[PDB]
Design an enzyme around this catalytic site. Structure first.
Site, PDB file in Angstrom:
ATOM      1  N   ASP A  16       1.035  -1.108   0.059  1.00  0.00           N
ATOM      2  CA  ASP A  16       0.023   0.048  -0.134  1.00  0.00           C
ATOM      3  C   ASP A  16       1.181   1.280   0.159  1.00  0.00           C
ATOM      4  O   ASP A  16       1.518   1.496   1.026  1.00  0.00           O
ATOM      5  CB  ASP A  16      -0.914  -0.063   1.389  1.00  0.00           C
ATOM      6  CG  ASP A  16      -1.634   1.221   1.316  1.00  0.00           C
ATOM      7  OD1 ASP A  16      -1.892   1.784   0.359  1.00  0.00           O
ATOM      8  OD2 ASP A  16      -2.394   1.531   2.461  1.00  0.00           O
TER       9      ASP A  16
ATOM     10  N   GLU B 231      -0.755  -1.014  -5.219  1.00  0.00           N
ATOM     11  CA  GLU B 231      -2.098  -0.577  -5.565  1.00  0.00           C
ATOM     12  C   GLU B 231      -1.690   0.720  -6.602  1.00  0.00           C
ATOM     13  O   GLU B 231      -0.985   1.440  -6.601  1.00  0.00           O
ATOM     14  CB  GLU B 231      -2.717   0.180  -4.223  1.00  0.00           C
ATOM     15  CG  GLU B 231      -4.127   0.259  -3.989  1.00  0.00           C
ATOM     16  CD  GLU B 231      -4.637   0.437  -2.593  1.00  0.00           C
ATOM     17  OE1 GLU B 231      -4.097   0.346  -1.733  1.00  0.00           O
ATOM     18  OE2 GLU B 231      -5.799   0.595  -2.405  1.00  0.00           O
TER      19      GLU B 231
END
Lengths: 154, 149
Positions: A7, A67
């Site tokens: 992330d 991501e």
């Protein structure tokens, strides 16, 4: 297949490692790295790069799932976060580990079944897929969700 | 007294090494590194970081002078390359100083308001032919740092 989910961020970097296939997955490790604004940018980047390089060397993943956000607000924030994303991509390439990017709707669809799921819904399914009792950090949870998403697309 | 100037970029990364002081400088090296969109972003970043690292390791500069960054996804992409440049400098232990375009013009040209800058780069360094603007810009940044020290 062993997958490192990432992330991406500068102040927070979520990292989550899982191993398995589309049918079953095992939790290996997760963490949220943090950096301080009082550190200058070069040191923030060096810290993230060093810690990620160490984790790549230790756990030896087959793939990274990262991501792919479409966040489009502030250029000054985007410049700083882009710097962190660059150093993350660099660490992966130096390790020889391929990067696969997934958008948030791909994650929601793979883990919950639908692309308009809430984040709490995704984290519930992360914990259930991995047998985790509690996940307090949303960046670590998102990183695990990315890793589980790659296993579903493989 | 040895400065590595960096004109940051992804497709083109200008690098210029000089040594000296405000009054006299000597040229040591310059290049424009290039990367192509045919490569994936991580490989482009790895190539630039590797070649920059090699130059920092070889020539051991005292300081790096970089162009100051004066759309969001454009900012994000520019940041990716800038981040890997900043990382190589931090790993080398070399301090980074950012300069804007007006500072370069004032340091190099009497007007202070690129053909004039490039002429002054060539004159200061004894360079006959300087064809790449990114390499020239990187040398202009290194010379600007000397003027500000």
């Amino acid at each position: 297949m062993r997958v490192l989910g990432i992330d991406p961020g500068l102040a927070n970097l979520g990292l989550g490692l899982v191993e398995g296939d589309v049918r079953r997955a095992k939790h290996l490790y997760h963490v949220c790295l943090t950096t301080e604004s009082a550190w200058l940018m070069p040191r923030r980047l060096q810290y993230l790069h060093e810690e990620l390089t160490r984790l790549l060397t230790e756990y030896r993943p087959d793939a990274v799932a990262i991501e792919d956000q479409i966040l489009r607000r502030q250029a000054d924030v985007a410049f700083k976060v882009g710097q962190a994303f660059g150093v993350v991509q660099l660490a992966c390439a130096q390790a020889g580990v391929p990067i696969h990017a997934y958008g948030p709707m791909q994650v929601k669809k793979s883990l919950v079944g639908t692309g308009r799921a809430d984040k709490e819904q995704v984290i519930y399914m992360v914990k259930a897929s991995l047998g985790i009792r509690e996940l307090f950090n949303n960046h670590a949870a998102d990183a695990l969700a990315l890793a589980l998403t790659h296993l579903a697309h493989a």
